[PDB]
Amino acid sequence: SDTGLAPPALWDLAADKQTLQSEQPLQVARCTKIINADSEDPKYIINVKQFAKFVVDLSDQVAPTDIEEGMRVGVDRNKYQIHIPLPPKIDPTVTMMQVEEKPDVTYSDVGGCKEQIEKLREVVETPLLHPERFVNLGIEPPKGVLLFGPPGTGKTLCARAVANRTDACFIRVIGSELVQKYVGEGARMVRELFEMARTKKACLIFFDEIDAIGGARFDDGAGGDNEVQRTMLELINQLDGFDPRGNIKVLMATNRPDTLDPALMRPGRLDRKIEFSLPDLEGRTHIFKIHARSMSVERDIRFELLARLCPNSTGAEIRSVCTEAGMFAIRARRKIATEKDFLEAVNKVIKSYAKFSATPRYMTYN
Amino acid sequence: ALARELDIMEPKVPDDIYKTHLENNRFGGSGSQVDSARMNLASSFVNGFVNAAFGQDKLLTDDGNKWLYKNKDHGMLSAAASLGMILLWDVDGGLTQIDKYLYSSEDYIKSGALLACGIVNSGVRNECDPALALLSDYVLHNSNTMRLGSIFGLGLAYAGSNREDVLTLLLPVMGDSKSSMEVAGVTALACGMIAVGSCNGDVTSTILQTIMEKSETELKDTYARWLPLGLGLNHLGKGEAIEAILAALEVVSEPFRSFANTLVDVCAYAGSGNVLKVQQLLHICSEHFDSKEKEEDKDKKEKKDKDKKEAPADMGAHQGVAVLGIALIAMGEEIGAEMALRTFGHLLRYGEPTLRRAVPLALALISVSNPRLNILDTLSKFSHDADPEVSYNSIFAMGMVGSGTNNARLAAMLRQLAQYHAKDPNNLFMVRLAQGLTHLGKGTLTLCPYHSDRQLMSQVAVAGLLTVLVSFLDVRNIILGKSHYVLYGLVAAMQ
Amino acid sequence: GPDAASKLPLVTPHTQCRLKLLKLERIKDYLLMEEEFIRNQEQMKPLEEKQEEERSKVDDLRGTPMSVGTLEEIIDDNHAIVSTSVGSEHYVSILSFVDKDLLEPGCSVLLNHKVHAVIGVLMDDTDPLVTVMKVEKAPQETYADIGGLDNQIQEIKESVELPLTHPEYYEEMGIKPPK
Amino acid sequence: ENSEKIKVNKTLPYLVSNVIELLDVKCAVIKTSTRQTYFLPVIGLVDAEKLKP
């Protein structure tokens, strides 16, 4: 035991006779890759993994059109005859980037970004859904969006939210995964990504934190960063590169917009740029509501006053006030918060921790 | 009013976007559109239900003439019923304009429309009770076809009604063998569920109408199973003092009397949690039939074991299912015993992944050896989590579509019409109360679709009759509303 | 996955309340019927023993020199591509004897040594990285030993220890614990 | 002869190899795609001049 013991009732359901009926009649094949289709009628050239490059034709049941150059196909283990086409090989590290479970956040937990949300839905949530509206006019909808702003403003939330409603496949990318040891295979992960996406009629790619692989072209004469630069070029070439990119709609959010190559920031690749500025008064008065809902309150709380006590407070700094104001109630042993509790919260998360912060040194985007 | 107007957001949900997320199927064909009615008919069923309660969210109705031309002559008869589902719970809104166009040709198309009437008229329980007045005339009219549609709708519309006039009135129509068998057979199921009390006069009369049948019809019928079901629920709670007459008077009958008598016992003994009564069912019954040619009885024996075991203090549920897998499938008979797949979903059907579905049922869903076996399990999954409002369900559904029996058309519509239909939102299917121990007597109607799909003679596989797979839905709503006399409105939270 | 112990931790009565007794007797009746339910059917149908016959046939279907390889991809169920020992990829056929659940893309697979196929998954050796940072128990330093810092011990207690011992507090005010 | 000639070719599976040195002491030395070298004394069913190293 401890290896593969499955539900014993399922073994008999496995029909051991059929298994014997399958552990003999079903010949085990070996993966291969086709290089040429030598003409005459059959005469396919083959390349097994690490045995040799043999010459094979067919068995009986694979239609000639079923096989094409550079297609994965299984072969006989004795006479080396093609029997079944095989899927192309996608790097497992690139195939794990596909999101299988939608994040549990919708387009109602981001507040104050009304204009940003609307401008982020006509390029990633309308060209795909209701795709006939644009047909009755000459419009290729913009393909690509850059979300930039100070840290803790909501760049990822508006992206994590879009994945909650999008019907097309959503592909992750962190911007640090595209950094790999050997020269070369940092562009393979950027070539395989789009090959997988093109296999999906509608696909979205979220190049989160595109600053580790999206730097500016810099030649110091001392062999500065080059592998990252090469990877960025492949990304730039696969968005408008003498080959229709397909239906892929990129979506990359950067913490440092003033660092990107002046070729990843032109229409065609990163078409529309959406600015995520610090919330205004009406904004942060709404962020407080969206984060203080599922909590006990005095009901009669001047949330507007609290909003105006933290003028340049990022969205994160507002949740920390709400998540900390109730903290002052857990300590007093009370179960219902109070405005005085929140005021002490603002005095700690906004004016007491302002020594470190991130907003003052980032709104210059440097 | 408070869902669309007050709420700022109001997006639309076209069917095409989510119909095929996996694009492997479309690859290679490159279009190749075909006029096959089998493909078209199944797709309409899925789309129609999702569009319910969407007055302005209709796009395939204004120009639906083209869809009518792309099918067979007899295909539209089954599709004609689906039109009514769109206008759900329309007492008079949809009927105002239909009457003016009634004086027209194409009377054949009218047959399918009536099937929709029964579903829409079910649950309203109007004091005037217009359903008989608006359905009795055509039933009595001399025509097998036009009254054929009326038979199904009448039973469902009067689930809460228990008037004896209708039950006796319907008996002669089914008792007339000069008409089609299906006409009488389909009706017999409807009448059984209407009466939940005793109904002594008709229960015995119904038995008589089954007794005076030839051996070939009685033996090889494939349709007599539903007969005890109506009687079984019509005799629930009866003791030995009542069944004594039935047993004593049923001692000069054919051996089939034992086949039917089995169902009554369980229904009467609603709560009878014990071991002595259950044991002879599995062992004594199984051994005795091995020496004779009689069959098709052990399957019903196992499915009814759910009774008096639904709520074992939330502790006997897990234990019961485990025994079934290692008992009814581990060494059971090759076909009949192995066909105890719809029992697991019957015991508890609300949606509870990772503990009761992936292991018990998901494993057997990939039985590619025999497509027929997958038929029972493919439909079994949809029943227990049809509307669970769980976002973590679609991953498993895509685990088989496009990777299994795709070339075969018979297995094609098994998964597409059911697996992709489990995305219906704002709907709940659990019928147990908050306590979870007090069941609803009339809410237990979700038991008929547990053996009909197995045989499939003009039932599922054969086109012409598919409303059987639409009538068993009887559940409550999942929406909770709060309001005041002057429409004040509160925002009180819940946990 | 499943837990061998804790069949029903219903200690809510926490006393001599009769409710404890009713549930226990329920299993006893079910056990009694199962006893003669298995042995009885095990005589006139001597096909599968389920204790010695069940294991025996699968072993023959397996091979004495069971192979070890890496599963590289998951083609349609009952079929997969497993990387051979050294460098070859085989389009093997998955046998139902495997749990069919632990087949993660790249963990491990046991294959027959002649007709190579999937015979069984293998648990993955604890990677050295896990053992590197898996601190077992703080040797001696207690929490009253630290001394001095008092107002600063409450913050750590209230962020990394309270939400795991008394979640109710960050359970009724609907506030997630400080990250 | 053609029936026998096809019999060797009828074994369609070939082993691709690259000619290394077309020695004239009209022989050939090949390097099969398995890291094995050989000294085919007779070139085979191909011209001795159409084969270049």
Ligand SMILES: Nc1ncnc2c1ncn2[C@@H]1O[C@H](COP(=O)(O)OP(=O)(O)OP(=O)(O)O)[C@@H](O)[C@H]1O
């Ligand atoms: N407008 C907003 N409304 C509500 N919550 C917000 C808003 N903006 C930010 N947040 C809060 O920010 C947190 C997550 O921040 P997020 O990672 O999206 O910010 P960011 O600035 O895009 O990130 P980074 O630059 O670190 O990648 C969440 O807890 C979320 O509640």
Ligand SMILES: [Mg+2]
């Ligand atoms: Mg981010």
Ligand SMILES: [Mg+2]
């Ligand atoms: Mg631009």
